[PDB]
Each structure stands twice: as structure tokens, then as C-alpha cells.
Amino acid sequence: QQQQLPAAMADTFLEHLCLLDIDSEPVAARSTSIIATIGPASRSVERLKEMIKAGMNIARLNFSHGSHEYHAESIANVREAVESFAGSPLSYRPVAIALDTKGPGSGPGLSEQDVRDLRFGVEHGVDIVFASFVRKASDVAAVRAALGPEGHGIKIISKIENHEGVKRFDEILEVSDGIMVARGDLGIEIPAEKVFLAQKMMIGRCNLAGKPVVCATQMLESMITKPRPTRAETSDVANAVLDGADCIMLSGETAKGNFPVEAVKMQHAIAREAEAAVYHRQLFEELRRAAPLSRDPTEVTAIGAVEAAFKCCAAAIIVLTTTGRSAQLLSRYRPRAAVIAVTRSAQAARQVHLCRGVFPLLYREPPEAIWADDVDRRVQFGIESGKLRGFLRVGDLVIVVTGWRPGSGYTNIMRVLSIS
Amino acid sequence: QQQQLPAAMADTFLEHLCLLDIDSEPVAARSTSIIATIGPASRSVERLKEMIKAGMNIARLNFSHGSHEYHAESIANVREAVESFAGSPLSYRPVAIALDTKGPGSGPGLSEQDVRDLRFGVEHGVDIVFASFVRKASDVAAVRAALGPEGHGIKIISKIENHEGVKRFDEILEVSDGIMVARGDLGIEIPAEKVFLAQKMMIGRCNLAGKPVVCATQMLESMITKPRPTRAETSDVANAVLDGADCIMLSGETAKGNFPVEAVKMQHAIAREAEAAVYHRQLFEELRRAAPLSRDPTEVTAIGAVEAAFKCCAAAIIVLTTTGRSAQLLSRYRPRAAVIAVTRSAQAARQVHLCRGVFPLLYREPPEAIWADDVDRRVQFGIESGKLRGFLRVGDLVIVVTGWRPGSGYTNIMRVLSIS
Amino acid sequence: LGTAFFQQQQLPAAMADTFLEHLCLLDIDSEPVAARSTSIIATIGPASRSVERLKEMIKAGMNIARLNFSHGSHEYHAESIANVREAVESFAGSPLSYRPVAIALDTKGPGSGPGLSEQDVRDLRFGVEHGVDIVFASFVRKASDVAAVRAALGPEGHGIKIISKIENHEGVKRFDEILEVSDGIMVARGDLGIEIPAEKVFLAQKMMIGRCNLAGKPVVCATQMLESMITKPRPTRAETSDVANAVLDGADCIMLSGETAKGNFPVEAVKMQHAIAREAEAAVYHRQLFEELRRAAPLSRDPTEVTAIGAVEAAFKCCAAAIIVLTTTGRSAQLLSRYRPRAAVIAVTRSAQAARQVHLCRGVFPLLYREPPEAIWADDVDRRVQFGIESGKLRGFLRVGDLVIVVTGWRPGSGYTNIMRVLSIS
Amino acid sequence: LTQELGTAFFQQQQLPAAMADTFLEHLCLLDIDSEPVAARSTSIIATIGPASRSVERLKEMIKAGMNIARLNFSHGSHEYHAESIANVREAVESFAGSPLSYRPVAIALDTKGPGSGPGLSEQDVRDLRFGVEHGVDIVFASFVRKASDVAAVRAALGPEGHGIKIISKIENHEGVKRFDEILEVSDGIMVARGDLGIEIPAEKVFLAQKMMIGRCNLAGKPVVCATQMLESMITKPRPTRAETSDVANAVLDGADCIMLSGETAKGNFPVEAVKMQHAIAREAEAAVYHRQLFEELRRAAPLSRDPTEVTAIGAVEAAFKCCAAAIIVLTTTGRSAQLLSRYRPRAAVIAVTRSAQAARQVHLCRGVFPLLYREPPEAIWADDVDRRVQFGIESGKLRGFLRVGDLVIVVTGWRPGSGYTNIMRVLSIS
Numbered sequence A, B: 001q002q003q004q005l006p007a008a009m010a011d012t013f014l015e016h017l018c019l020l021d022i023d024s025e026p027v028a029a030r031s032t033s034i035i036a037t038i039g040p041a042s043r044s045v046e047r048l049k050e051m052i053k054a055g056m057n058i059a060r061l062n063f064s065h066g067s068h069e070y071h072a073e074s075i076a077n078v079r080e081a082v083e084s085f086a087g088s089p090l091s092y093r094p095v096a097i098a099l100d101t102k103g104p105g106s107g108p109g110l111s112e113q114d115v116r117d118l119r120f121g122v123e124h125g126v127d128i129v130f131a132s133f134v135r136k137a138s139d140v141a142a143v144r145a146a147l148g149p150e151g152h153g154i155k156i157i158s159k160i161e162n163h164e165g166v167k168r169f170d171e172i173l174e175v176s177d178g179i180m181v182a183r184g185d186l187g188i189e190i191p192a193e194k195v196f197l198a199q200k201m202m203i204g205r206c207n208l209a210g211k212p213v214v215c216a217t218q219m220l221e222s223m224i225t226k227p228r229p230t231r232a233e234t235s236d237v238a239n240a241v242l243d244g245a246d247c248i249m250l251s252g253e254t255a256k257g258n259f260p261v262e263a264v265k266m267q268h269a270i271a272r273e274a275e276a277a278v279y280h281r282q283l284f285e286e287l288r289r290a291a292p293l294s295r296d297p298t299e300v301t302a303i304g305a306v307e308a309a310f311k312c313c314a315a316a317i318i319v320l321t322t323t324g325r326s327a328q329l330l331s332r333y334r335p336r337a338a339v340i341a342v343t344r345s346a347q348a349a350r351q352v353h354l355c356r357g358v359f360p361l362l363y364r365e366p367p368e369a370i371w372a373d374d375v376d377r378r379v380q381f382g383i384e385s386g387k388l389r390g391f392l393r394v395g396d397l398v399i400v401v402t403g404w405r406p407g408s409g410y411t412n413i414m415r416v417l418s419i420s
Numbered sequence C: 001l002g003t004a005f006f007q008q009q010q011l012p013a014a015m016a017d018t019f020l021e022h023l024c025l026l027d028i029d030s031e032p033v034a035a036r037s038t039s040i041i042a043t044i045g046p047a048s049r050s051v052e053r054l055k056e057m058i059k060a061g062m063n064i065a066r067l068n069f070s071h072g073s074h075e076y077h078a079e080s081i082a083n084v085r086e087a088v089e090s091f092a093g094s095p096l097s098y099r100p101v102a103i104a105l106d107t108k109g110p111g112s113g114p115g116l117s118e119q120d121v122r123d124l125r126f127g128v129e130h131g132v133d134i135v136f137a138s139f140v141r142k143a144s145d146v147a148a149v150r151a152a153l154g155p156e157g158h159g160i161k162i163i164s165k166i167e168n169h170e171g172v173k174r175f176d177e178i179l180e181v182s183d184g185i186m187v188a189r190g191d192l193g194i195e196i197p198a199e200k201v202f203l204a205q206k207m208m209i210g211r212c213n214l215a216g217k218p219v220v221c222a223t224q225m226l227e228s229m230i231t232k233p234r235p236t237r238a239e240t241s242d243v244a245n246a247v248l249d250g251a252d253c254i255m256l257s258g259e260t261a262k263g264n265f266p267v268e269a270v271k272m273q274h275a276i277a278r279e280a281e282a283a284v285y286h287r288q289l290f291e292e293l294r295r296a297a298p299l300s301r302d303p304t305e306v307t308a309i310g311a312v313e314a315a316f317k318c319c320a321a322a323i324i325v326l327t328t329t330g331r332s333a334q335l336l337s338r339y340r341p342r343a344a345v346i347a348v349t350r351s352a353q354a355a356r357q358v359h360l361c362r363g364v365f366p367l368l369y370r371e372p373p374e375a376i377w378a379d380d381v382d383r384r385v386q387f388g389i390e391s392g393k394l395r396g397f398l399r400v401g402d403l404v405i406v407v408t409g410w411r412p413g414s415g416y417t418n419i420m421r422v423l424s425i426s
Numbered sequence D: 001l002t003q004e005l006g007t008a009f010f011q012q013q014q015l016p017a018a019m020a021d022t023f024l025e026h027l028c029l030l031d032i033d034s035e036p037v038a039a040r041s042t043s044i045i046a047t048i049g050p051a052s053r054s055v056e057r058l059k060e061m062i063k064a065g066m067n068i069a070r071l072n073f074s075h076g077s078h079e080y081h082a083e084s085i086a087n088v089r090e091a092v093e094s095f096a097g098s099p100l101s102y103r104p105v106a107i108a109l110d111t112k113g114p115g116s117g118p119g120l121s122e123q124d125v126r127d128l129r130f131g132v133e134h135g136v137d138i139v140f141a142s143f144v145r146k147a148s149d150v151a152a153v154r155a156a157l158g159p160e161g162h163g164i165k166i167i168s169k170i171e172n173h174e175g176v177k178r179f180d181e182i183l184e185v186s187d188g189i190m191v192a193r194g195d196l197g198i199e200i201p202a203e204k205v206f207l208a209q210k211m212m213i214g215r216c217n218l219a220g221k222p223v224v225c226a227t228q229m230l231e232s233m234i235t236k237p238r239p240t241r242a243e244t245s246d247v248a249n250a251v252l253d254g255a256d257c258i259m260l261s262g263e264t265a266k267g268n269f270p271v272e273a274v275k276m277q278h279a280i281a282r283e284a285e286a287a288v289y290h291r292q293l294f295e296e297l298r299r300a301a302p303l304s305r306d307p308t309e310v311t312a313i314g315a316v317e318a319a320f321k322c323c324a325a326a327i328i329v330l331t332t333t334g335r336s337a338q339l340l341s342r343y344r345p346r347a348a349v350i351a352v353t354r355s356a357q358a359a360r361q362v363h364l365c366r367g368v369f370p371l372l373y374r375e376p377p378e379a380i381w382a383d384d385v386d387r388r389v390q391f392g393i394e395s396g397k398l399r400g401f402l403r404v405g406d407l408v409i410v411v412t413g414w415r416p417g418s419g420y421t422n423i424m425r426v427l428s429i430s
């Protein structure tokens, strides 16, 4: 069979490793979202469109370099390239816009420049903030305050860049929306030979907590100048996916390199192969065993849907979401099935890329008179969207996750549907 | 906590054994159905009513002793005592009627008397047939043929009573509806020291097949004369439940003994305690791992519902059934939650006692004009009944299993309900 | 390779990856070949006082002889000890087939008051004077009760093993403190089934056996195991079930109280208990049992404990017929037993008391070495090795090629075990 | 007063992370402050070239932890490689003054390959005969595609080259497909990712690496991870975040050896790359989840009636039970040490042998620390055995392996000869 299914059927992880096949082509859609740093090499509207077609999910704006005028233009080009595909909603791919802060610099609270960068992001409608150099939970609260009452929906991903941040990780993760393993600065503050330990630990604690985790810095570094990466670069990218990272990131690879689209395509290729090599048998059992009991129907429905999808090898789990939460809760159980999130919120659709295996679609049509009808219309939108994108074929089984009443947090239904 | 919950939380079976508490009272309803052999000591309509209140689920008619007139009278008195409780529809407990055949005696095929006995059972509306001395799959086919065209809906439980029956078990189970470990005759054909091996093997193979299994003969033998059983008798009963038997049975204990109701009450008491001592953590994992993948939504919904019920420690899994199949498929995954089956079929309600943890409700209310309304009215019937019988309290969580259109084999929905 | 050995003593059922597949692979035609591990304790009464009949019970597999001091005078029980030791030493002519038997004293109990009853003090002093090996302390409810029994033994009764009978609710609740100070536990289901609901007795049994297995201390299942056999020649289906399940639960010993003491079939009950125990031992799922027992056992800096886990692991790897261990106090063999190997722990000791007492730990087969000590200890141990090997070649335990694990020490005495060595037979 | 000095232990070398019941819990328990204390297991293979040819710099590489010296026969004349052998052996035997701290180094020959078309290359025949004549210990057979290719290399060595270990470099798709037959006839495998990354898609190389390492771990045969491990260190003093990651992951995957090519052969930081590979490998070994690794390795290993194999599993089990500092094994061929290594113990497998070749070759097995016993054989073998055993104890005492009060597992045999191992004995230090 295909997509490492004989390797996934193995009773032991050693058996699984021995059953890995280079000829077993991956068929599932690429789960681990790609974050591309936008710079001179990736700012043109034609090239940005190419990167979207290549699989860029999030666009990073590094506020360490660049003026507010430069970054406002970065956003416009990004938006314009994304919106050119709006004419065909069944194929429109949303892209999130993230702001990577410059950092507290001198050491104390939040830098004055960062307050001005954060209020700019709020004004320009950014979805995610990569908080540079977070060392404690008070640093996160300061960033949340710097966004104000308008920046409430914006996701805060804390960049762990030093030893203090690693030690105080649990308090930072509790108050953050997710973590970024910013290996660049981290490789300097702590010994370079200990960085993998911090990466693997953070990814593990994030997987345990259900919160997104981003692997960052020098993933395909040689591709800035060369058309093909090193054997260690392909290895690192594949291992970040195998470790359980929700996102993979490109810095100078897409910002100032000669091969921006090629780095995106390469990251996509490796991530797709690594996802099929995931030992879901033990991964799901351990994730389920580790997850505490829940009396929230959204969480209870998530584990039931993931279990049901595993049983029939469901091609996708279509979930109707409003804030992204239902999709995030399905993602935490790491299913082999694609979590197709259908939401009317464009912000939630962009943000849900931080979760692994979540494929957002934006329902652009107005709500129907009968809620039951409007719900079924969105389920069909996700079936039609997944059919033209290759996710679904006729005769496939899908798990459909819905709620009992309109509004966020009412998810409670899982239903087994047969395609067409 | 109560119902061996600290013992169930343990990561290892040894830790589970060490965590068993005598003071941890069981709270869940008694799953393992009790089959009581009706004889002179239990013929009384007055006494039958007491045994129904004591927890008798199935009434066995041993055709080795007794005339057709004697047994048609026993059935008439059983049904009289059962329909006396039909005034309260939320608390009406259905009882199945089983016919235990005399056996092939000599051997050319099915005995001449058995053909008459089987024709009688069909005419008298029996639900289950205990086929005595089954040695091959041809023996089962002969019994099904004997049940003519009318009797095609009677469940056939094959009594494995000899060495040939044990050897040819897999072919017999494939054609049977379930197995009875008839240890009486079995303990004579094969060495008495090897009977436990055959019992444990058959129960294991039946659990793996999802088919019911009955433990029979000398379970509380001393209680025929004495008011209290031996330490080995309580042990055997508890161990049959721990082994994974769907049903426990009383022969002379209830048919000709001085303590018929007391034996039923005692079997109930032991079974309730043994069910709380079940290590569901490994049991469910092994049962799930062993069960093959399925493209049947009834099957897929069952594993999703059982997984969702474990996650929240759901009070009960309310399933709407017609043939009892949906409830049986939930039972095979051995949930801690009570599978409350809500059916309009009187026969299916009686027969569903063969599956462990299935609590049937006969829905006598008239069909509503709108099917979705009728489904919800039936779903609420299960909630009303369980809540009345102590199964449910307000604020509890239940897993509700339904289907997309009316008619059997369309089950595909699992929905997390919060009581009242 | 062993052709018939593939379908043998539930080996296909033991090879299974899951316990459910293990249950499905159990075969009635797979005859057990290994020696019977779970020791049998027979209560000696009027039906079993006869020296002639005692000899039959020894040949039938009785390992320990119980003296119930609830009935009988000191003269009545001293005669029993003489009858027993007489039958015991009748087989001493052939030391290679010499089966030692332990003598246990079951106390009457504290009656109805705080402290050890006055009769119990006399009974315990009697046992010390008569050289009993084990004491079944009736109605133990706390760790102070055990200390009182140990004090009543005095300076002479130091080697005597104290098995605490848990017979009531207080004893069940205070189990961990009682086990810490006891040498082992008896699940005295008779009295226990009265103090706590009869439907909760199996819970207490399974818990105690589990905690004893965890602690490495012996555990005895007692009362009404083959109760119907007091009057009838064959037991009930529930009785064979209970006996088999006690073995499957992990009990080191099975007992016959009243089934041998006053029943028409004393030898037949012993033979039946032996037959069931042998079948149940082959049905043990050693794959998960050993993994769980190893995982649960704490790490140790004691070479006797470290050697035990290494020897049990080595025996599983090659399907060693037996693990021959050279003990002095029965500790090295007890430490091997706690890891529950499929191989027979053949204990070779010069201590007659330790040889009798080592019956309390499951799978331990004691062989009293009567030959005199050689001038060189580095010669003595090597001859003590061959003594145990030839007892297996006589008793059927071993055949040519049947590899064995040999457990010895660096110097002679108590607790200097540190060597495990893989030996090939002939 | 605050007598918890065993709190410092159990908190070092990822011991809290190793004690976890689940692999997720293990990942969550990994600590950057938990310093590794055990000796570095995964052997380092350094490619010798212009940057690493001087005897002076070779001595620093040996002190930095180089275990095997690779001679790439794709570049270089027979005169150049023979001079490299003299410079290497000269630098190695400079430390022979203290046998209790002498570190042996193996010499490997990496062949040029069959070139353009089937059959063993004509240059390779000359190269292989040269290696035999010059006493090489290992041969990295370039571009092995089937079991016949291995047999051709074994034949090309001749009757003299019988002890030489043959590590087959899997460099193409055919080699990956026909892996099981190649491993059966090879002494070990090299995951030569350089050539491999060209023959098969670059995104599928990790799959081939992880599969090969897994099958090698299953078979008990050594496995080497090769090509671009610390590539940026050829020019820069510090590696990339992906390079440290890849090195650590090769160890975590279960590779017995890690390798440096241009990194030491033609780079500006040869010693620094060796020191860096050592640093990462040491940290990655403490992060190994031995709890499931040992259970899976034991479960997967077939039952054996060979006492050498039975003693190995018993010794590894006994070492985990007491957290033995080291497992001292007496070996002649290196087989007893290899069989202990396959079960992947946390204890250091200290191999004591009188064979200089076996001592060099035993570096291919992970966690095997060879010490060459130069003392003369005693008249009675019985005494001589417990003095070679004591040599290992005194060697560990000096080399920081053994502290007083520690426990060691000692693995010996019943008679002098290969494969006669059958004894495991628990010894307390000093």
C-alpha cells in the first residue's frame, strides 16, 4: 500500500522503522503549516502568489529589520496575492499574517519600539504575534496589554530564545497561545549541543498541552544560495515533523534567498513524507492516555471523532468551527485524517493554520433561514472544496463534527458520512 | 473513590490488582445478564415476580425434563409475571425466554424429539435456543432449519458440551449467534482439570468475535440446599465476569433448590462487584487493537461512542435500536457506561440481554408524525427511564447513538448530551 | 530444535502478543510438562492422621502439613508431628528423590480481647519446642499482633516463618503494615467471608495476592477450595475453577482445610489440587507477568537481587529447564521466585529447615544435600551443582541439551550470591 | 545536614526523563540543565585529508574523541594513503606509554566504487589488496547494490583479509530495495546519504536512513550515519541548528557511528568538528528512551540456545537493575561485546581483549570501550582471567568510569576460546 500504511500497521515502533518504504508515496494532504519570512526576495505580488500555490500558510514580518512603511507594504502585497484566488472559493487558500517582534533588547519589560510595532500590527489586522525573547509569564501579559482592547483575537506565540525562557516554560505556555522554538538566539544563550533537547522537550510539552508549536531558524539555510539543501537540512525538517511540531519556518530562505519558492516547495515535500512516517499507533494511544478526562462536549466529541476516523481510515474530518477551537481539539489527538475546518470567520480561518492538519475553508455565502439547512450547506461546501482539491473521492468516508445550536463552543455531534 | 475507580486508573494490571478496595462500593448497574432455569421451585407466578425484581434477565426451559404442556404453562406464567410490571413504562424490565434442547442423543442428525421441541419453541415465541451438544457447524444449520420459516429470528446459542465441540469451535461460532460453556457435560467428556482452559479460551474467542458467551453449570451449586454459597462458588462467579462472559447461569440452583430468589440475588451481588474490578484500560485497548477496521458506520459509530464515553465517564450510552445490532456493537467494545437500548421491538428488547451491559427499554408510545421528533421523544424516553432507575442524574453526560434515516443498519451519529 | 515442544505446556498461548490472543490460544490438548510450582498445604485431621495414608499424600504432592490448633490437645498434635516426621523420613533412603515436607501450626486466634490469647502463648511455645517451620497466625488485625507472635516464639523461634492470616475487615484495611512485619500472608477466606460480604471476598483475595506478588512475599489461598470433595469423589466445576484461578491470580500456595482433615477423599483432593495447579501454571501469561513484575520491582544495589533478575531473564531467553540455585537461608531462591520464571527454581541447601520453608515460595524445588563439606569450598559448590543436576535427571526436570541457569556466590554464608552461569546438560 | 547527594544523581544524564512511563512523558522530562555524565558511546569516524594529515593535529583529534580514521580512496594515491597510515599509527602509539589510558583507533578504507557499470572496479581491486597489505581494519564498500557485490569485495581481499570488517555503503535505490540480502552478507551498513540523496528524492532520504538503522538495530549489526552532518563547519567555527539536530537525531535513531567527511578532511575546523560531534552525541545518548528501546529490542530478538547471547541479555538486564557503571566483558573476537551492545544498555561495555585488531574494530559497536591487555599470559588460565578482569577495573578507575562503591557486571567464559562466554557476575568496586 501507499502513505506508509504497512509501516503504520506494525505492532512495535522498531517494526514500524523496519517497514518504512521509500517507494510508498504519500497521498494525504500536507499537515505541518509552513511560515515564510517575507523580505525583498518574497515581496512581489507575482512571487507571493507562486509561494501560496507552493503551500505557504503563514507570512512572517520580521520587525527586527524594516520600517513601519516597509511592513505596511509587505502586508498589502501579501493580502493582494491571497485575494487574487478569491474568485474561486472552492480553491481559495487563506494565509495568516504574523508579526515577529524585535525583542525587549536591553533586558527589562517590553521595549518602547515593540509597543509601537504591536499597535501597528493591531491597526493592520495581523493574526499572529511572535513575541521575541519571552522569559516569564509577565512578558506575555505585557504583549497582550500592548495590543489593547482591539487586539483580543490575535494569537500570541512566545518565542523561547534563552535559558530563563526554557526554565520558566510551563508558566509561559499557560499564558501563551503557543510556542516558537527560536533556535537561532537559543543556540547562542545555551550550548549548541543542548538545543535539540530544548526543541524536543518544548514540542512534547506543547503536544501534551494541545497548543501549537513552531520549529524555527536554519531549517533549509543552504537554500538561500543553493538550489538543493544539505542532507542534514532535509533530516532536520523531517525530524521536526516527526517530533510533533505543528509549524515549520523559513527565515532568509524566503526573505533574502535566490530560491524562495523552491524552499517552500522543498519544505512541503519533506513535511508530506514525514507525516506518513508518523507512528500514529503509539502516538494516538499515548496522546489519549495523557489527555485528562473532560466534561466538555467539544473535547469529548473530538476524541470520539478521531477514534471513529482511525477505525474506518476516514479521508477527512469535516468540522464546523467559529473560533477554530473545535479544529484545534481534533488536531491535538493527531489523526491521520485531514481536519477540514469550515468557518465564516476569515481571522479564525487564517489562525487555524497554527494547528497541524487543519485545512481551513471560508464560507462566504450568507446564513440560510433554517440553521439545519445552513449547516448542511457548509458541510457540502467542505465536501465540494475537498473534492476539487483531491482530499476526497466518491465512496470515501468522512467524520462530520457539528453542534446542536448556533454559536461557538456548542460542538457535540460526530456523524459518519459517505462521499457522494 | 467508588466502583473501583482508583483501581481502574492504574497504568499496570499489577497496580490495578493492588488498588482493589473492599470499601469501594459498586455504583453502576449490573451488566452480566442472569439466566435462571425455571423448574418446580420457580414455577410460581408469585415467586417469578420476585426473581424479576431480583434481576433475572433470561428464563431457561430445560427440555431434558418436562412435557410440552408443562413448558407452555411455565412460559404462560413467566409472561404473566413479566407483564405485571408493564403499568410503569419507564421501569418495565423485559425478560427473554430460552429453550434448552435435550440433545442429539444417538447421532445421525438432530434428535426426533428436538425437532418437535424446536417447532414448539417457534410456536410459543421463544427468543433464544440453547442447542445441546453441538459438535460441528452442520449441527447448528440443522437447528436453524428446525426453526422453520417463522423461527428465523430466534437467537441460537450453541452449547459446547464435548471435546469435538471444543476442537471445532471456530466453525461453530461462525454459524452460531453465541456460545454456552456448558461445563456440566463438558467436565465429563474432557478432564475436569482442563475445563477452566476451555472456558477461558471460548470466552476469549467470543469477546474477539463480538458474540455473546454464557458461563453455565454449578456456579452456586451449594445454594440448592444451603442459604449461603461456598468461597469457591463466589470466586467462580466473579471470575466468569472477570473472564468476559456476557451471561451467568443458574440450573438446579433456581429450578429445584430451596433458595431460588436468594441465588439470583447472590449472582447479582457478585456480578456487580466483579464488573467494577474489570481492568477496562487494557481490556478496551486490546479489544480495539484486535477489532478489524470497518467501513460500516454502525461499527465506526460504536468505537467512537465507546471512546467518547470513556473520556468523560458517561453515565450511559443511549442507543436506538431495532434488531439490537447497534447495541451489540457498542457492547463488544466493553464500555464502563451502561448501554441503554431503546427499541420498539419486543423480541429485540428480550434478546439484547445476551449482550453484556445492554439495558433494554420497550418503547410502547405511538409514532409521532415527524420522524426526527419521534427519535428525540424515544431518546428522551431512555433518559427518563435511566434517570428514574438511578442510572442518570441531572448534569451527567450521556453518549447518544442514532441514525440518519429510519430503518435498521443506518446508525451513524454519536452525540454528547448533558442531562436535563 | 524441539519438534513436539512447539505444541506443549501452552507455549503457543504464551507466545501471543496480547492477553486476549493468549486467551484465544489456550489448548485443552496442550498437556503440561513442567513440574507443579504452587505448593499444596494439607490440614491434618482424623482422615489424614494415619502414617500409612500420610505416605500416600506425600507421593500425591503434599508440600506442607497444617496442624489446626483450634481443635486438638497438645498430646493430639504432638502425635500428629511424630506421625508426619515418621512418614517424611520413610523416603530418606533415596536422597535424589527425597521430598521434604514443612510443618505448619495454625493458631486458634486471639478470641475476644486486646492481645494474644493465653492458649496461643502455650501453642506457640509448643511449636517452638517441636521444631515447626511455619506459623499461621489466626486473626491478625495490625502489625502489633505480628510482633506479639514473634515475641511468643522467644530466642529459639527465630527461624520460624510467620504467615499472617487476614481473617477480618481491620486486617484487610491495615494490610500493608501487617505484610511489612510478616513473612507472608494467608487469605483465610473462611472467617473473612463472614466479617465482610461474601461477594467482596474475591476482591480482597485478588488484592492481597497482588500486593504479595509486588512485595515478593509468599501468599496462600485458603478455605473451601475443593469443599464438595469432603463427601464426593469429584469436585464441582466452580471448585476446579477457583483452584485454577488462585494459581492464575499468583498465589504461591493452595490449601485444603477440612477437605483432607475430615473428608472421605483426602489423597484424592491432594491429587486433584496438583492436577489443576499444573494446568493453571502453563496457562500463566508470563510475557506480561514478567514485564510487569520487572517494571514494578525497585532497582537494587544488592547483588543477590541483581543476579536474580539476570538469571530469570537468561532463563526466559533460552527456555531453561531449571534454575539451580545454591542457597543457605532460602533467600536466593525466594528472590528468583518473585520474578515468576517458567523455569523451575531448584534450590540446593544443607539446611533442613530452609528446605522445608522454601515450599512457601512458588516454583521452588528443594533438594537437601546430605554429603559432607569438602576441604575446598571452590570444590564443594561444584559438587553441590552436580547434585541438583542429577536430581533433575532422575525426577524428569532435565534431559540432555536442556540448558540450565546456575546461581552461586563469591564466598560461603548468607547473602553472598552474585554469579549466574549458563550450563548445558550432558 | 542536607544529605541528599543521590538527588544530584537521578537528576543528571536525563535520568528523570529516562524513568518516565511513556515516550511523551520522556520528551516532556528532557532537561537542558541535566548534564550528561556517561562516556560517549556513538563512535566518531573522521575522514583524513590535508587538514587532518599532520601527526601533531591527528594527536589532538585522538584526544578530541576520534575512534575511526577514514581514508577516501576516491581521491589520493597509494603513496599518499600509506603516509596517512604512518602518520595515524604514529600519533596513536604516542599514547601507548600508559596502557590504562591508551585509546586504540581503527583504520577504514572507503573504496572508490564500481564506477560506470556492473562488476568490482579495477582500481578497487588494487585498493582492496593495498588495504589488506597495510593492515586496515574496516572497508567501506562504495555503491553496494546486491549480496553478490559484497562477496566480490570479500573475494578481492583474499585469504589474508579474513578478519577485515566489511561495511556496505548503501548509495542508490537498488541498494535500498535489496537491503536485507546485503545486510545478511555484510558486517554492517553505512547510510551514505551523499550519493543516496541524488539517486532517490532528497525528501525520502530520512526514510531510508531511519529504516536501515532500524533493521541494523534489529539484526545487531553496526550502522554508520554519513555525509554533511556538520557541513557548515568546513568554513565556520560553529554549526547550524539543523546540523546539531541531524547529529543528535542520528544517535537518537540508533546509529552506532557518526561520520565527518570534508568537515575534518579539508575544513578549517577539523578538531572542532570532532569535539562538536562528541558534545552532541554525549547529550543525545542521555536522551535515549532506554525503557522502551530495551523492551522492544528484547521482544524483537529471537530466543537463543547460545550461552554467549543468553549471558548478554542477562547482563544487560542485571546492569539496568542496579544502574551498573559498566559491563566488563572479556573478549577475543569482539563478539561477546557486540552481543551486549545490541541490547543497548545505559552501562558502558568495557571490552578487554589481547587482540589489537578486535580492539580497533569493536569501535563499530555502540557503547563498546576497548582496552588492549598487553601483560603476558599467566601459566594458569584461571588466574589470568581474573587479572584481565581486574585490568578493566583499574582502567575504569583511572579513566573516570569507575568510582569506589559502584557496581559492575562482569562477563566471562568457562574455557579459553571464541564464543565460550557463559558467566555474568555482580562485582562491587574497590
Ligand SMILES: CN(C)c1ccc(S(=O)(=O)N2CCN(S(=O)(=O)c3cc(O)c(O)cc3-c3cccnc3)CC2)c2nonc12
Pocket: B013, B014, B017, B207, B242, B243, B244, B277, B278, B279, B280, B281, B282, B283, B286, B287, C018, C019, C020, C023, C210, C213, C248, C249, C250, C284, C285, C288, C289, C292, C293
Ligand atoms: C498480578 N499478576 C500475578 C498478574 C497476573 C496476570 C497477568 S496477565 O495475564 O498478563 N493479565 C491478565 C489481566 N489483563 S487485563 O485485565 O488487562 C484483560 C485484558 C484482556 O485483553 C481481556 O480480555 C480481559 C482482561 C481482564 C479484565 C478484567 C479483569 N481481568 C482480566 C492484563 C494481562 C499479569 N500481568 O501483570 N501482572 C499480572
Ligand SMILES: CN(C)c1ccc(S(=O)(=O)N2CCN(S(=O)(=O)c3cc(O)c(O)cc3-c3cccnc3)CC2)c2nonc12
Pocket: A013, A014, A017, A203, A204, A207, A242, A243, A244, A278, A279, A281, A282, A283, A286, A287, D023, D024, D027, D214, D217, D252, D253, D254, D287, D288, D289, D290, D291, D292, D293, D296, D297
Ligand atoms: C508525542 N510525540 C512527540 C511522539 C512521537 C513519536 C512517538 S513513537 O514514534 O510512537 N515513538 C518513537 C520513540 N519510541 S522509543 O523512544 O521508545 C524507541 C523505540 C524503539 O524501538 C527504537 O528503535 C528507538 C526508540 C528511541 C527513539 C528516540 C529516542 N530514544 C529511543 C517510542 C515510540 C510517540 N509515542 O508517543 N508520543 C510520541
Ligand SMILES: O=P(O)(O)OC[C@H]1O[C@](O)(COP(=O)(O)O)[C@@H](O)[C@@H]1O
Pocket: A298, A320, A321, A322, A323, A324, A325, A326, A327, A401, A402, A403, A404, A405, A406, A407, A408, A409, A410, A411
Ligand atoms: O469550534 P467553535 O469555535 O467552538 O464553534 C463551532 C460552532 O459552529 C457550529 O457548528 C455552527 O454554528 P454557527 O451558526 O455559529 O456557525 C456550532 O454549533 C459550534 O458551536
Ligand SMILES: O=P(O)(O)OC[C@H]1O[C@](O)(COP(=O)(O)O)[C@@H](O)[C@@H]1O
Pocket: B298, B320, B321, B322, B323, B324, B325, B326, B327, B375, B401, B402, B403, B404, B405, B406, B407, B408, B409, B410, B411
Ligand atoms: O440497531 P439497528 O437494527 O441497526 O436499528 C437502529 C435503527 O433505528 C434508528 O436509530 C431509528 O429509526 P427507526 O426506529 O424508526 O427504525 C435508525 O436510524 C437506525 O438505523
Ligand SMILES: O=P(O)(O)OC[C@H]1O[C@](O)(COP(=O)(O)O)[C@@H](O)[C@@H]1O
Pocket: C304, C326, C327, C328, C329, C330, C331, C332, C333, C377, C407, C408, C409, C410, C411, C412, C413, C414, C415, C416, C417
Ligand atoms: O540463600 P542465601 O541466604 O541468600 O545464601 C545463598 C548462599 O549460597 C552460596 O553460594 C553458598 O553458601 P554456603 O557455601 O555457605 O552454603 C553463598 O555465597 C550465598 O551466601
Ligand SMILES: O=P(O)(O)OC[C@H]1O[C@](O)(COP(=O)(O)O)[C@@H](O)[C@@H]1O
Pocket: D308, D330, D331, D332, D333, D334, D335, D336, D337, D354, D412, D413, D414, D415, D416, D417, D418, D419, D420, D421
Ligand atoms: O568475544 P569472544 O570471541 O566470544 O571471546 C570470549 C572468550 O574470552 C574468554 O573470557 C577468554 O578467552 P581467551 O583466553 O582465548 O582470550 C573466554 O572464556 C571466552 O570464550
